[PDB]
Amino acid sequence: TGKAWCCTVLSAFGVVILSVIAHLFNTNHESFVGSINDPEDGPAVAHTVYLAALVYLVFFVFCGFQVYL
Amino acid sequence: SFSHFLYYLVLIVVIVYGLYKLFTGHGSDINFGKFLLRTSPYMWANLGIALCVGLSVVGAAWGIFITGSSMIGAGVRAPRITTKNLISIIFCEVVAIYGLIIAIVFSSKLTVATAENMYSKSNLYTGYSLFWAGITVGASNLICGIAVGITGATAAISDAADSALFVKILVIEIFGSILGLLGLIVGLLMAGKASEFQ
Amino acid sequence: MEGVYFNIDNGFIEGVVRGYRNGLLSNNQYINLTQCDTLEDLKLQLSSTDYGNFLSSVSSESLTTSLIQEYASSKLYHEFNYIRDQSSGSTRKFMDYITYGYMIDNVALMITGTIHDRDKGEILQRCHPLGWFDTLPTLSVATDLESLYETVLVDTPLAPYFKNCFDTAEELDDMNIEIIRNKLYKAYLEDFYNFVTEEIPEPAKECMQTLLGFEADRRSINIALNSLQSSDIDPDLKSDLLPNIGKLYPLATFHLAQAQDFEGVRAALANVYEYRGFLETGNLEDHFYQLEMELCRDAFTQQFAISTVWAWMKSKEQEVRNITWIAECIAQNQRERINNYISVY
Amino acid sequence: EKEEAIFRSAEMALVQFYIPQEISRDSAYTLGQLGLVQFRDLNSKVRAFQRTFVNEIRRLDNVERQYRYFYSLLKKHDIKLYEGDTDKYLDGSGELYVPPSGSVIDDYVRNASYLEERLIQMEDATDQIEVQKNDLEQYRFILQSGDEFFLVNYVTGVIARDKVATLEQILWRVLRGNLFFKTVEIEQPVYDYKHKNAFIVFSHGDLIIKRIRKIAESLDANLYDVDSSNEGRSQQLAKVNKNLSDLYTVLKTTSTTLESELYAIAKELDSWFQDVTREKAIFEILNKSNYDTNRKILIAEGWIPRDELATLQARLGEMIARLGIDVPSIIQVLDTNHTPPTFHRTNKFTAGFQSICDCYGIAQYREINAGLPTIVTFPFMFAIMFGDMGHGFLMTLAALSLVLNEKKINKMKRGEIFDMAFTGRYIILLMGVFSMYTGFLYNDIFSKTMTIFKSGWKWPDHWKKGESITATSVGTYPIGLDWAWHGTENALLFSNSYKMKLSILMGFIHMTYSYFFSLANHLYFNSMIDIIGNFIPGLLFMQGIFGYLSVCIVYKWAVDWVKDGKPAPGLLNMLINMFLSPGTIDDELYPHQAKVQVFLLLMALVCIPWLLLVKPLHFKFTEDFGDIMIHQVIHTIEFCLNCVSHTASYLRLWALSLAHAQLSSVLWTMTIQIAFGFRGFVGVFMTVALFAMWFALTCAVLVLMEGTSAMLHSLRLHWVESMSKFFVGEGLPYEPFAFEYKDM
C-alpha cells in the first residue's frame, strides 16, 4: 500500500544519488573538495557513503517484497 | 487616550529642552544648519527614490479594493459589468507607473563622489531636490489613488442600475487622474537642473 | 472621511444591498398588478420582476392571500440572514439590535397564549423567525413575570430592559402586557441610540439619529390615543412609557401624557411642523408610512454608510404590505381601494 | 474530407426539419442518438409558462420525481443499487436505437403511480410502530440501571445532548438552594439521527414537580414512570421487556415484505431510469419548433457542422424507409446573419490545453484559436522559472506513470485533487521535459553543476591560500553557462545581468507573434480599415521603442568594447535621454545614433492620433459616433500602457528563477553538507536522516509550491499579456443535443 511506496521510491533514488556522490569524493572532483570549506580527505568520505547507501537498498528489497504481495 | 497622551508629552520635553538651552546661553547649539551640512547627501536622495515608488504604490493598491470589492458586489445580480467597469482599475494603476518612471530617472543621477568634493554646493542641492521631489510625487499620487477608487465604486453601482449613468461619471474620475499627472510634472522641474554627484 | 476605511470589511455588503433594491417595484410595476383578474394572472405577472418563480411548488387551487404574504417574507429573511452571516464586528451588532425588536413581539405573543390556554404548535407558526432564541418556547410555562424572568429571560440580551417592569400583580392579564411591551421600546430605542452615537461612524450617524427620532414619535403619540379608549390613566404612569430621543422630547412629551381628549393632543403636536397635520386629515397610519419612505429614500442617496440595511428592510416591508392589500382586493372583487398602495421608487 | 478545426472553428450553417406529426417523436430520437445538432428557439418570443406540449412533459417530470424517491428508500435501508458495469449496451455509440412504443412508456407512467402507493403504505406501517420501538427501548434502559441512579418527588426522561446544557442551568434558578441532578449518556445515537442523554431530578413535594414536568416537556423530553422500591421497578422491567420480544419479531416481518419488494424493484429500476429521461428531453426540443395547427408542419432549425451534412443526409434516408412515408424533403439550408457558435475538435492531448483558454473567454466564430501556441509557450515558461534538471526529472516520472496506466485509471473512481492531475497528465509531462533542457543551459542539478565540456576561462599558474585571484579568457563555452562561475564571488553580477536581458527579448518575441494573429484575422473577415486604423499604429509605436531596445542589446554583446578602447554605453541612460534630452548622448553605440532616436520618437507621437481619429472618421464619412469615438479613445489609453506594463511584467521570469536557486543552494548547504564533516556510525546516521529531510522538502516545497506559484504566472502571461492583443471574445458555445448517464 501507500505506506511502502514512500520508503520504496525514496530509497530507490537515495541509492542512485548517494552512489554518484561517493564516486566523486573518491575521484576528488573540484566542486566537492576543491574549496577549503569542503572536507580534505575524499576516500575517507566515500567509505561512509557506500554503507549508508546500502541501508536504502535494504528497505528497497524489504518493502519490495511487501508490495509484491 | 494613551497614544494621544504621548503627543502632549513630546511637546513638553521639547519646550523644557528648548528653554534650558536658552536661558543658560546655549541656543546656538541646537543648530539645524550643521544637521543639513554634515549629513550625507546620499541619505536624502535614496529616500525620495523609495518613497516615490513607496507612497505611490500604496495609492494604487488602496484604490483597487475600494473599487474591486464593490464591482464584485454588484456583479452578483448583474455580472455583465466586470468588463465595462474595468477602466477604473487602469486609472488606479497608472499612477504607479508614474512613480516607477521617476525612480528610474533619479537612479541615473546616483554616482560616486570624492571625499573632498562631497559636501559642496552642487551635491547638497541635488540631494535636497531629489528628496522633496520624491515626497511631492509620492503624496500626490497617493491621494489620486484614493479619489479615483471612491469615484470608481459609484460608477460600478450606477452601471448596475442603468447603464446610461456610467459615461457621465468618468468626467469626474478623469478629473481625478489629472492630479497624479501634475506632480509628475512639478517633480521633474525640481530635478531638471540638478546634476549627478561629482 | 466617508468611504476610505469602509470597504475594508463592509464593502461587499454595500454592493449586494444596492443590487437588491433595483429589484424594488416602481409605480409602473404596481399598476400591472392592479388590473389583474385573479391570483393566477398575478403569478404570471410577478415572475417578470425580481420575485421570479417563487410559486413553482404551488398549485392553482392553493392560491390564497395568506400563502402569498408568507412566501414573500420568507424571501426577505434568506436575504437578511445572508447579509448577517457575511458580516463582522460593529456591523454584526447593528444587525443584532434589529433582531432585538422582532423578538419582543414574540415575547408578548407567547405570554398571551398562556392567558388564553392555547397550544404552542398553533402559536409558534405565528411567531416571527428573526426574533428567535433557544429558550423561547419555555415562556409557555407560567403566568407570573418573575417566574418567566429568572427562568428564561435573564440569559437573553433583554436582561437590562426590565428594570421598570417588576411592579406586576400576581395575576397577569392582557391590558398589563401592552404596558410591559411598551416599556421595552422605551429602553431599546435608547440603548440602540447611545450605540449609534458612539461606535457607528459618520454619515450613518446623522441618518440613524433621525430614523430613531421617527420610530419614537410614532409610538409616543399612539400611546396618548389608545389611552382615550380606556377610562383613565395617571399622567405619571404615561411618562414611563414614552421614549426620550425624539423631536417631541422634552417639550411636547409633557402635554401628551396630560392630554385627555383628541383636541388637546393636536395642541401638543401643533408646535412641531414635522407632525402638524397628520391628525387633521385622512388615515393616520398612511401618513406615517409616507414619511417613512421619505426618510429611507434620502438614505439611499448617501453612499458608504451602513444605514442602507435598515432602510432596505423598512422599504421592503411596505412593499409586502402593498402586495397583500392589493391581493385581497383582486381576490374579493372589491376594486375600490386597490390604489391606496404606497410607493416612491 | 474532414476539416480539422483546431486553428479556426468549424464552418457550419443552419438547417430546417419539416417534421411530420406521425413521426414527430420517432425522427427526433435519431438526432439524440447521433448527437451533432444544436437548435435555436424561435418559440422564445412566446411566453414560457404556456407552451404546446406542456401537458406531456409536466406529466413526466412528476413521474421522474417519484423514481428518485424509490432510490431514496434504498439509501435508508441496508441495500445497494445493483448497477451496470458499462454503457455500451444502451446504444450510446453510433449504433442506432429503435424508440420504444407508447405502450412501453404508458406502462412506465402507470408503473410509477400505482407502485409507490404500495410503498407509501408499508413505510407508514413501519414508522407507526418504529416510533413505538424507540419510546419503549429507551424506557427499559433507565430501568436496567434503576438501582444506582437514586444513590413522588422525582422525575426521569431522555433529552438530546445540546438541550441538557440549557436545562441544567435553568433548574438552578428555579431552586437555588438544593438541586440533585445526575446524567447518563446513551452509547448509540437515536434516529429522529441525534444522540440523547438520560437524567433525573429530585425535588421537594408536588407543588414543584408538576412545573418541572412542564419545563422539561416544553423542551424535547420524554418523561417516563418508575416505581420507588427496587422490587417494583424490576416488575415494570419484567413486563415491558416482554412486549419488545413479541414486537421485535413483528418488525422483522413487516420490514421484509417491503425489502423483498424493494430488492425486486431495485434490480429493475436502473435500466428504465434513463429510458424516460430521453422521452421527456425529446419534447423539450420539440416545444421550440413552430407547431402549425391548420397544416401539420413542424419547423425546427438547428446548426450542424458542414463536414457531417452527408452523414445526416444519408442517415435520415434510412429512417424514412423504415416508416414507408418518404416525405418529399425534410432538409434545406440557407444563409442568415445570426451569430453561429464556436466548436473546436479536441483529442486527449489538446483538450487539457484547450480547457484553459476556454475559461477566460469563448472565441469569436472563425478566429484564431490560442490553444495551439499554448501547448508549448505555457510549459516552456515554467521551465525558465523552475529551471533545474533535478526537479524537472521528478515531475516527468509522476507524469510518466499517470499516462502509461491511463486505461486502468479511467475506469476506477477518483478523488478531486487526483482528477485534475489525470486531466492534465500531458501538461505535466512537458513541464518536466523542458525543465531538463533549461537546467542544462543554466547548468544546475540539485544546486550542483556539470563539467562536461572545456571551460573557456582559465586560472593563473600559481597562488596561495586566502589570496584573491581572477581568471583569463581563452575561448567560448559552447552550450550553456560555463562551469567556472559556480562558487565564485561575482556570479550573481552575471546571471542577474543575463537573465534580465533574456526575459526582455523573450517577452518582445512572444507578444509580437501574438500580435500578427490580428493581421491574419482582418485578412479573413476582409476588414482593411483596422489594418490601417488599429494594427499598424501599434506596430510602429512599440517596435520603435522596444524593438530598438531589443536590437541594441544584441549589438552590445557582439562588440569587443575593450579592444577598440571605447567605453560600453549604458542602455538605461540611452532610453531615457532620447525622450528627455533628445539629440544628446553620453556614450556612443553606433554611427548616427541620435539621428535615429529623434525619428523613432517622432514616429511614436504621430501614431497616437492616427490610432485615435482615422477609424471614427471612416464611420462619419462612410449619437452612434459618440459611441465609436469613446471606445476608440479607451483602446489607446489602454494599449499604449499595455505595451509598457506588460513588458515589465515578464520580469517575473527573472526572480522566480533567481529564487529557485537560493532555496535549492541553501537547502543543500544546511542539511547534507553538514554530514560530510562527520564520520563513524554516528556519521552513517546523520547522512541517512538528513537526506530524507532533504528529499522531503525537495519533493514538497520546491516541486509543488514553486510548481503552483510558477504554474499560475505562466497562465497569467497568456490571458493578460499575450492574448489581450488579438482576443475579442463574446462567442456562443456549441453544446449539441445528445445523451449520457446521470450520476444521480
**In residues, how long is chain B?**
198
**Does B22 contact D at CB distance below 8 Å?**
no
Q: Which of C244, C274, C275 is nearest to C257 (CA)?
A: C244
Q: Which of B82, B108, B110, B195 to mutate to test the interface with D (most CBs of D within 10 A)?
A: B108
Asked if D36 and D739 touch (Cβ cutoff 8 Å), the reply is no
Q: Give me the residues paired with residue D17 across strands.
A: D300
Measured between beta carbons, which residues in chain D are less than 8 angstroms from residue A30? 451
Q: Which of D711, D668, D715 is nearest to D690 (CA)?
A: D668
Longest dimension (CA), chain D: 120
D523: its cell numbers: 485578412
Q: Which of A63, A60, A56, A69 is nearest to A3 (CA)?
A: A63
Minimal CA separation from C217 to chain B, in Å: 34
Measured between beta carbons, which residues in chain D are less than 8 angstroms from residue A48? 679, 683-684, 687
CB-based contact B69 C11, cutoff 8 Å? yes
Q: Which of C40, C136, C138 to mutate to test the interface with D (most CBs of D within 10 A)?
A: C138
A22 three-state secondary structure: helix
d(CA C94, CA D665): 55
Bridge-based pairing of strands D290-291 and D180-185 is unpaired
Minimal CA separation from D486 to chain B, in Å: 30
d(CA D682, CA D700): 28
Report resolution (Å) to 1 decimal.
3.6
Amino acid at D402: L
CB-based contact B146 C11, cutoff 8 Å? no
Measured between beta carbons, which residues in chain D are less than 8 angstroms from residue C152? 170
Q: How many other CB atoms are there within 10 angstroms of residue B35's CB atom?
A: 9
d(CA B132, CA D35): 71
Return the half-sphere exposure (C-beta side, CA atoms, 13 A cut-off) of residue D138.
27
d(CA D436, CA D666): 21
Q: Which of D100, D305, D92, D302 is nearest to D738 (CA)?
A: D92
Amino acid at D69: Y
Give, as one character, the DSSP assignment of residue B30.
Answer: S
- The DSSP code sequence of D400-454 is HHHHHTHHHHHHS---SHHHHHHHTHHHHHHHHHHHHHHHHHHT-BTTB----SP
CB-based contact B72 C12, cutoff 8 Å? yes
Chain C residue with CA closest to B145: the answer is C4
D26 three-state secondary structure: helix
d(CA D397, CA D410): 19
Cis peptide before C250 (omega within 30 of 0): yes
Q: Which of C2, C16, C87 to mutate to test the interface with B (most CBs of B within 10 A)?
A: C16
Bridge-based pairing of strands D12-19 and D38-39 is unpaired
- Which candidate from D170, D174, D218 shows the least CB-CB separation from C137? D218
Amino acid at C104: I
Tell me how far apart the terminal alpha carbons of chain B are, to the nearest angstrom. 51
Handedness of CA C97, C101, C106, C112 (dihedral sign): positive
The answer to whether A and D touch (≥3 CB pairs < 8 Å) is yes
Measured between beta carbons, which residues in chain D are less than 8 angstroms from residue A49? 687
- Which candidate from D572, D580, D641 shows the least CB-CB separation from B97? D641
d(CA D82, CA C180): 65
Amino acid at D261: E
d(CA D66, CA D60): 10
CB-based contact B73 C16, cutoff 8 Å? yes
d(CA D485, CA A8): 36
Name, in order, each residue with C-beta under 8 angstroms of D38's C-beta and a sequence gap of 6 or more: D302, D303, D341, D734, D735, D736, D737
Helix (H) or strand (E) segment spanning residue C339? none
Q: Beta strands of D306-422 (E only): which ranges?
A: 332-334
CB-based contact B73 C12, cutoff 8 Å? yes
Q: Which of B62, B64, B70 to mutate to test the interface with C (most CBs of C within 10 A)?
A: B70
Name, in order, each residue with C-beta under 8 angstroms of A24's C-beta and a sequence gap of 6 or more: A32
Handedness of CA D226, D232, D237, D239 (dihedral sign): negative
D17: its cell numbers: 426539419
d(CA D431, CA C39): 64
Minimal CA separation from B108 to chain D, in Å: 7
Q: Which of A29, A31, A59 to mutate to test the interface with D (most CBs of D within 10 A)?
A: A31
Touching B (3+ Cβ pairs <8 A), the chains are: C, D
Asked if D282 and D56 touch (Cβ cutoff 8 Å), the reply is no
Bridge-based pairing of strands D332-334 and D154-159 is unpaired
Measured between beta carbons, which residues in chain C are less than 8 angstroms from residue B69? 7, 11-12, 15
Solving technique: cryo-EM
Please name the residue that has the C-alpha cell 419539416.
Answer: D18
Return the half-sphere exposure (C-beta side, CA atoms, 13 A cut-off) of residue D474.
12
d(CA D496, CA B74): 45
Asked if D663 and D702 touch (Cβ cutoff 8 Å), the reply is yes
Please name the residue that has the C-alpha cell 513630546.
Answer: B10
**Does B73 contact C at CB distance below 8 Å?**
yes
Chain D residue with CA closest to C44: the answer is D49
Measured between beta carbons, which residues in chain B are less than 8 angstroms from residue C83? none
Per-state percent for chain D, helix, strand, coil, to nearest 5 = 60, 5, 35
Chain A residue with CA closest to D688: the answer is A52
Long-range contacts at D422-425 (CB < 8 A, ≥ 24 apart): D423/D352, D423/D355, D424/D352, D425/D352, D425/D399
D144 three-state secondary structure: helix
Q: What is the CA radius of gyration of chain D?
A: 40
Chain D residue with CA closest to C149: the answer is D173
**Does B93 contact D at CB distance below 8 Å?**
yes
Measured between beta carbons, which residues in chain C are less than 8 angstroms from residue B150? 3-4, 304
Chain A residue with CA closest to D485: the answer is A31
Name, in order, each residue with C-beta under 8 angstroms of D207's C-beta and a sequence gap of 6 or more: none
**Does B110 contact D at CB distance below 8 Å?**
no
**Does C117 contact D at CB distance below 8 Å?**
no
d(CA D675, CA D680): 11
Minimal CA separation from A17 to chain D, in Å: 10
Q: Note the Cα C119 to chain centre separation in Å.
A: 26
d(CA C235, CA C258): 6
Q: In chain C, positions 127-146, which contact chain D (CB-CB < 8 Å)? A: 134-135, 137-138, 140-142
CB-based contact C14 B66, cutoff 8 Å? no
d(CA D592, CA D603): 17
**Does B87 contact D at CB distance below 8 Å?**
yes
Helix (H) or strand (E) segment spanning residue D644? none
